[PDB]
Amino acid sequence: MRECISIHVGQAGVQIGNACWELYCLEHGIQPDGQMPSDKTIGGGDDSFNTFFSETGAGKHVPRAVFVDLEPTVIDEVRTGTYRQLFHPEQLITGKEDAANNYARGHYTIGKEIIDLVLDRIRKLADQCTGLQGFLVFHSFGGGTGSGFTSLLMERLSVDYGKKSKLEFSIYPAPQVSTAVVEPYNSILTTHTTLEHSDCAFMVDNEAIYDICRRNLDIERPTYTNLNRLISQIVSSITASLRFDGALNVDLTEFQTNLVPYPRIHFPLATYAPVISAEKAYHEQLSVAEITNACFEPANQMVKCDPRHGKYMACCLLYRGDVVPKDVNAAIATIKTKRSIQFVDWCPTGFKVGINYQPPTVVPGGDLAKVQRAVCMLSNTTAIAEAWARLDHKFDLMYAKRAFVHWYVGEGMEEGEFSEAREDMAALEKDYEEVGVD
Amino acid sequence: REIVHIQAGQCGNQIGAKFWEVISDEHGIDPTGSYHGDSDLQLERINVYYNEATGNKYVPRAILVDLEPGTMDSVRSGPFGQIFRPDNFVFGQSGAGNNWAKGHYTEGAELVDSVLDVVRKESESCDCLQGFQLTHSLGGGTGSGMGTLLISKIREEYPDRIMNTFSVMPSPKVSDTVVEPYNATLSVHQLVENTDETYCIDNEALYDICFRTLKLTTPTYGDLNHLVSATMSGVTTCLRFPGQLNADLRKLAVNMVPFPRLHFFMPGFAPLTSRGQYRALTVPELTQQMFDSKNMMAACDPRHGRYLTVAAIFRGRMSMKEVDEQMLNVQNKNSSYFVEWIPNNVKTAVCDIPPRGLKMSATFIGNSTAIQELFKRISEQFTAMFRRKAFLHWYTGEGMDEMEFTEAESNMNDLVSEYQQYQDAT
Amino acid sequence: MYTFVVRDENSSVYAEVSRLLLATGQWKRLRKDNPRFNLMLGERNRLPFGRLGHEPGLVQLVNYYRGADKLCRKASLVKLIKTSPELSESCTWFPESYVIYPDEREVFLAAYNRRREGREGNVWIAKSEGILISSEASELLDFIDVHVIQKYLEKPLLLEPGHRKFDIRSWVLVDHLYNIYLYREGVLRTSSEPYNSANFQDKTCHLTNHCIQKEYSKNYGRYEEGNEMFFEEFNQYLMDALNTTLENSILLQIKHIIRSCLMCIEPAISTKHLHYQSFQLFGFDFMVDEELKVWLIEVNGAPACAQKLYAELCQGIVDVAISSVFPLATSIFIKLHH
Amino acid sequence: MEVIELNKCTSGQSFEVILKPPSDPSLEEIQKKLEAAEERRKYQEAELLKHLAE
Ligand SMILES: Nc1nc2c(ncn2[C@@H]2O[C@H](COP(=O)(O)OP(=O)(O)OP(=O)(O)O)[C@@H](O)[C@H]2O)c(=O)[nH]1
Ligand SMILES: Nc1ncnc2c1ncn2[C@@H]1O[C@H](COP(=O)(O)OP(=O)(O)CP(=O)(O)O)[C@@H](O)[C@H]1O
Numbered sequence A: 001m002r003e004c005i006s007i008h009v010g011q012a013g014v015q016i017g018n019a020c021w022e023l024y025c026l027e028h029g030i031q032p033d034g035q036m037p038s039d040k041t042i043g044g045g046d047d048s049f050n051t052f053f054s055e056t057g058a059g060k061h062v063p064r065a066v067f068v069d070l071e072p073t074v075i076d077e078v079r080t081g082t083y084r085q086l087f088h089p090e091q092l093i094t095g096k097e098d099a100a101n102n103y104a105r106g107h108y109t110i111g112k113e114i115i116d117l118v119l120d121r122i123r124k125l126a127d128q129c130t131g132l133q134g135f136l137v138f139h140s141f142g143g144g145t146g147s148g149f150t151s152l153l154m155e156r157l158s159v160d161y162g163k164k165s166k167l168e169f170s171i172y173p174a175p176q177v178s179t180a181v182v183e184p185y186n187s188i189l190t191t192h193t194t195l196e197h198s199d200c201a202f203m204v205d206n207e208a209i210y211d212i213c214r215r216n217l218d219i220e221r222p223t224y225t226n227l228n229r230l231i232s233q234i235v236s237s238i239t240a241s242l243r244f245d246g247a248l249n250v251d252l253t254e255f256q257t258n259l260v261p262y263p264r265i266h267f268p269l270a271t272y273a274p275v276i277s278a279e280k281a282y283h284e285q286l287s288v289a290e291i292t293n294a295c296f297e298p299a300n301q302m303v304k305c306d307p308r309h310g311k312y313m314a315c316c317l318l319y320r321g322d323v324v325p326k327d328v329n330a331a332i333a334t335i336k337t338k339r340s341i342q343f344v345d346w347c348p349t350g351f352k353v354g355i356n357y358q359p360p361t362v363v364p365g366g367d368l369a370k371v372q373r374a375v376c377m378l379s380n381t382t383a384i385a386e387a388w389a390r391l392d393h394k395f396d397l398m399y400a401k402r403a404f405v406h407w408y409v410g411e412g413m414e415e416g417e418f419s420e421a422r423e424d425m426a427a428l429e430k431d432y433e434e435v436g437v438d
Numbered sequence B: 001r002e003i004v005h006i007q008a009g010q011c012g013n014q015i016g017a018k019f020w021e022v023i024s025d026e027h028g029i030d031p032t033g034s035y036h037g038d039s040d041l042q043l044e045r046i047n048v049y050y051n052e053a054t055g056n057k058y059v060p061r062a063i064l065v066d067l068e069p070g071t072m073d074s075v076r077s078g079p080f081g082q083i084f085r086p087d088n089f090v091f092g093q094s095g096a097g098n099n100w101a102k103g104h105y106t107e108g109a110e111l112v113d114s115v116l117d118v119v120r121k122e123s124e125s126c127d128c129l130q131g132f133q134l135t136h137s138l139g140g141g142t143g144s145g146m147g148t149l150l151i152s153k154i155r156e157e158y159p160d161r162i163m164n165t166f167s168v169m170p171s172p173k174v175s176d177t178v179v180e181p182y183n184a185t186l187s188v189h190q191l192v193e194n195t196d197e198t199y200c201i202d203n204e205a206l207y208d209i210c211f212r213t214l215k216l217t218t219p220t221y222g223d224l225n226h227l228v229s230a231t232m233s234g235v236t237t238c239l240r241f242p243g244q245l246n247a248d249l250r251k252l253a254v255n256m257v258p259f260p261r262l263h264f265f266m267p268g269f270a271p272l273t274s275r276g277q278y279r280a281l282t283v284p285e286l287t288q289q290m291f292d293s294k295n296m297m298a299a300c301d302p303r304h305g306r307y308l309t310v311a312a313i314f315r316g317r318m319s320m321k322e323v324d325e326q327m328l329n330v331q332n333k334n335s336s337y338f339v340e341w342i343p344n345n346v347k348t349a350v351c352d353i354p355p356r357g358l359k360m361s362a363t364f365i366g367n368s369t370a371i372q373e374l375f376k377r378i379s380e381q382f383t384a385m386f387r388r389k390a391f392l393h394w395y396t397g398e399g400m401d402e403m404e405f406t407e408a409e410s411n412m413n414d415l416v417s418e419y420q421q422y423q424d425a426t
Numbered sequence C: 001m002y003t004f005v006v007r008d009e010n011s012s013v014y015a016e017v018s019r020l021l022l023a024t025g026q027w028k029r030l031r032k033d034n035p036r037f038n039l040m041l042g043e044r045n046r047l048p049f050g051r052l053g054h055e056p057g058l059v060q061l062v063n064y065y066r067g068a069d070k071l072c073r074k075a076s077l078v079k080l081i082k083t084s085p086e087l088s089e090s091c092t093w094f095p096e097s098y099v100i101y102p103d104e105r106e107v108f109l110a111a112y113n114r115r116r117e118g119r120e121g122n123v124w125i126a127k128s129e130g131i132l133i134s135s136e137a138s139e140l141l142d143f144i145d146v147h148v149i150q151k152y153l154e155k156p157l158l159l160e161p162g163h164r165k166f167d168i169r170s171w172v173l174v175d176h177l178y179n180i181y182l183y184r185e186g187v188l189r190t191s192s193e194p195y196n197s198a199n200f201q202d203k204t205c206h207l208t209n210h211c212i213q214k215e216y217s218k219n220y221g222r223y224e225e226g227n228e229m230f231f232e233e234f235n236q237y238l239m240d241a242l243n244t245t246l247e248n249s250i251l252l253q254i255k256h257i258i259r260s261c262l263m264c265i266e267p268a269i270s271t272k273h274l275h276y277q278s279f280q281l282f283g284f285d286f287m288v289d290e291e292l293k294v295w296l297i298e299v300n301g302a303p304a305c306a307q308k309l310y311a312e313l314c315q316g317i318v319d320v321a322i323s324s325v326f327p328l329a330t331s332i333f334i335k336l337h338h
Numbered sequence D: 001m002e003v004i005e006l007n008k009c010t011s012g013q014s015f016e017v018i019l020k021p022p023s024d025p026s027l028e029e030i031q032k033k034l035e036a037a038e039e040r041r042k043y044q045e046a047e048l049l050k051h052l053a054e
């Protein structure tokens, strides 16, 4: 067994962090106080859930998690919420005054004064690890902390833990649920400086989650709570292989070898089905073929884009619930006949499948109905580059006028980092285009 | 968390007083300083503007400055006059005579250190000071000349804190003396340099609104200040109540100010109400009115420029889905007056608690290049006198030189060219 | 009031569509790069499909189907036909064609000689204005040094008087619901020079492009204005001369071809459940042989209309493709059903 | 369509299905740049403070 440390950064990272750890507890039978009656190996364990929880001699199961925000409001709701007891006070790190949606403030000015403290609270968790795999890093692109401090943290983790894997869950900015305007700046800056430090990154566009919430959950105006409970369902289906018995995606290194052959192109698309409203009075349960087919509908992706006009480098199906291999293969066969699934020439056309018999756990009183079977598809398709094209274009429009640049220069960034970051993204967009179009 | 408020001069103290009345009623604080409200949402951000004091009363983080005692004795006598910390009343005796030079260089300099001692005492009790707000006029002597001297000294002592002003702009329709364009032009350069946000409250627009629209035949300063206190309440709703965003002054400035000198905002309010109606506005009505020129407190035509950024804050119980559609309706309907190179530059927030006496309201904050019309107007009035050196002796008598006027006029015209550069851009 | 953008200034068709939209008083035109549009009439090359459908509160429509170029460029059309089971390698209405780079070159020459030792005609054309026909394989393989080589149709239907060759251009609008609409008025692009089976490198007799005929051919405008015969005259000719109609002898085949080409790529390009929506106007080019059999030549993705029909067709693009999506305050199309 | 590497346990199974075969900076460099930005920030503030001194 090998342990995994989860790092939640900024408002978005912290609140998604809370949604997941809540879900993790409900899935593993861990109560809000940290007790797990089913764990008969008290005070320790080699088990699969122990990759995410430590055990105290008092039988308390404690997330391998650190929360960091440059401002206290959001982490203070961790400190006082249903899961107060779960967390060691030393795992919740807050500053005084936030990064004001300013990457430079998060990376240079405010980040420099708190990086060593964070690395020290991370090192205290790493020291309780017999064999640490690495890190799962949750954060927004658009926030000043989520972007600025995260990239600084990622740089230092690469020097301090050189051979460990680092995975990201990254919230990509959507105007519908954001009051900022400089988020294109922060996203490009944090992507450029984090790229070579991240082995695998799952992007979630708030636009896609918002619309899934509206269309499939009949929520008229989704809140962050709606968004995050849905997000944490996806994250949980992605990490379940790290926390349960099985043979697929069993360590962090496997995510990269299974999903990222070319290391710069390390942004797999997530697609999730089915999302069903808990207030739907009568629901006809969906079959294996219907939910697997739904993995190829753009309306169910974490990033709205069109995979028919790209090429696949890898594809993984993660089913939870009543599913057997024969029904998966029967669904796949009918789907290749009717869908445009084109792999790159240097990769086999095929699917790595993992099945967990336990159906999705849902948060009591959430918006998601229970379902007998669900699937999360992870596909590394070049079509996700559409999201880089959108963001870069927004960056180009503002930067051509140097709109808002003075805010970054005034925190110690040089103008030339903007264009160095933007040109890295231009390299990235062309890498995708080489790999994926003829 | 904490904002420190400063009010300078007659105008600064009269609107400042009404601002504290209005928001003290919104947070349930009475003239005693006693919280006597019903919802704990009134208290959750009470510390932004109030200190908790002896007896668990709430005391405004407010400093009251004048060069003459008149208006401040009438504040202490006013409705909420006892709510203020008596130590925070800082006044001279000799007045400023509507003379920027007296406020900035002679009489005001005598008094300014005294004011900074009070500012320091209020900041040191601040867990994490966000910044400062100043109420003042630009047309007189104290609020204009000493106000901007204060702002310079505050920037020297706290160069990493936000400075925002609510700045009343002079107009011949509401005019105390002929030298207002002189005082305003000298002040506008101070503001260009040392302010993060300036709300340009034009006494022309306030007058026109009271007259043309509230059908007030002869508006008083009280008519005008009712609009100002209602707008200041709306502009600060963000910071005083728990809502969707958690944005401090810096974050608000970050998303409104693309260029450091272009930080002069046109405020607006809907529905427009006189001191003494029962039909609530529909969300389409709130939205249309807040973008209507006649609801703008800076007498500029928004169709004569382009919006760099817009913020809007809706107050009351309402459908944010309907807000979303109406906000997106008025943009996608008129995208010709928003710059195309700042994507998604119109931002909206809702707060459930409405102001006193309305079930629905909307505050508009526009960063439009049309604000150049205000500065051109002041500049034309400035040069009409300055090309004859008229009334200059009042200033040279306090040590100023004509050259300082030549520089101020020329800085003002530069500011105007800057706005015109972006009104034609892409 | 709806908004639109115009990113292809040189399109005859949508130039007229833009002017019709404004005249309704309910459409306003924005500048090229304003992203708050309802409708985009986009560039022909590198159109940014990835940026569409991400503006909150705006339904967005574009006049191009992403992916439809596979139908509309010579080499990809052949690859699409031979490799798609819906249009088999055994496809009765496409000329035997070959993709040769400066690959199937060795595959092709096996076809040459079984016909050459089989006592059959062996005239071929090479395509990609740089277009050459001959019965020498050496000829064009020499000249190619991507291109396409396909059998020249050595017995075309020839109109009289004139003994002249022709091709048929059909205009097809596919709306956002993937309804396939064939415009009732086609056009027949004729040669004014008579046809001759020996002098292949007298190509003004063998290639019926409107450009060649106007100033590279001797007798242009002789028989009909424009070298353009519309459907009513062509129909009367087939009645008077061949004792049949345009509908029975040719249009049935044309409709079958259009529907089968478009139904084939539908899963690849449909926008049914996408966050933005497409329509597109295609120009289909047919050759008719002397047995009244129709052959598809090539599909044009950005076609120009014939001058008499602009008004009626562009008004039908607004009605069926644009106001179907953005409503305002008998049809000229045949709906091909699937 | 061949089913490969099937592994079963009591919580679930995994396998692959194939349809077709194929055709860093140092600690010192980081702290250098974090301190370069801080002196750019201390220089710009000294410029303001001198400007305020004139
Ligand atoms: N999905 C989701 N997105 C969020 C959440 N909170 C904030 N965001 C998004 O993240 C972006 C804003 O960044 P934040 O995470 O709030 O900022 P931060 O990391 O705290 O950095 P600063 O507050 O600037 O110091 C916007 O696009 C928000 O819409 C959340 O709880 N869930
Ligand atoms: N296989 C074939 N057999 C006989 N004639 C052919 C032929 N292929 C092409 N032609 C003739 O060649 C002409 C031009 O062919 P092609 O379709 O390649 O040109 P083009 O792309 O310019 C037409 P468009 O303007 O509609 O795109 C046709 O009008 C037809 O007369």
Ligand SMILES: Nc1nc2c(ncn2[C@@H]2O[C@H](COP(=O)(O)OP(=O)(O)O)[C@@H](O)[C@H]2O)c(=O)[nH]1
Pocket (backbone or CB within 6 Å): B008, B009, B010, B011, B012, B014, B015, B096, B097, B098, B099, B137, B138, B139, B140, B141, B142, B143, B144, B168, B169, B170, B171, B174, B175, B176, B180, B203, B206, B221, B222, B224, B225
């Ligand atoms: N809106 C408004 N304007 C005022 C008020 N009092 C004065 N003014 C304007 O302020 C300018 C005179 O400044 P004033 O505050 O009286 O001078 P000071 O006390 O020396 O700062 C003129 O433009 C007046 O019209 C007021 O209560 N409300």
Ligand SMILES: CCCCc1ccc2[nH]c(NC(=O)OC)nc2c1
Pocket (backbone or CB within 6 Å): A179, B133, B164, B197, B235, B236, B238, B239, B245, B249, B252, B253, B256, B311, B312, B313, B347, B348, B349, B365
């Ligand atoms: C999402 C909508 C944002 C609304 C908004 C935007 C900018 C602001 N700046 C100030 N400043 C202030 O109140 O000074 C005392 N308030 C603001 C409110």
Ligand SMILES: [Ca+2]
Pocket (backbone or CB within 6 Å): A039, A040, A041, A042, A043, A044, A045, A046, A047, A055
């Ligand atoms: Ca155990």
Ligand SMILES: [Mg+2]
Pocket (backbone or CB within 6 Å): A010, A011, A071, A098, A143, A145
């Ligand atoms: Mg934050």
Ligand SMILES: [Mg+2]
Pocket (backbone or CB within 6 Å): B010, B011, B140, B176
């Ligand atoms: Mg006065």
Ligand SMILES: [Mg+2]
Pocket (backbone or CB within 6 Å): C298, C300
């Ligand atoms: Mg062509």
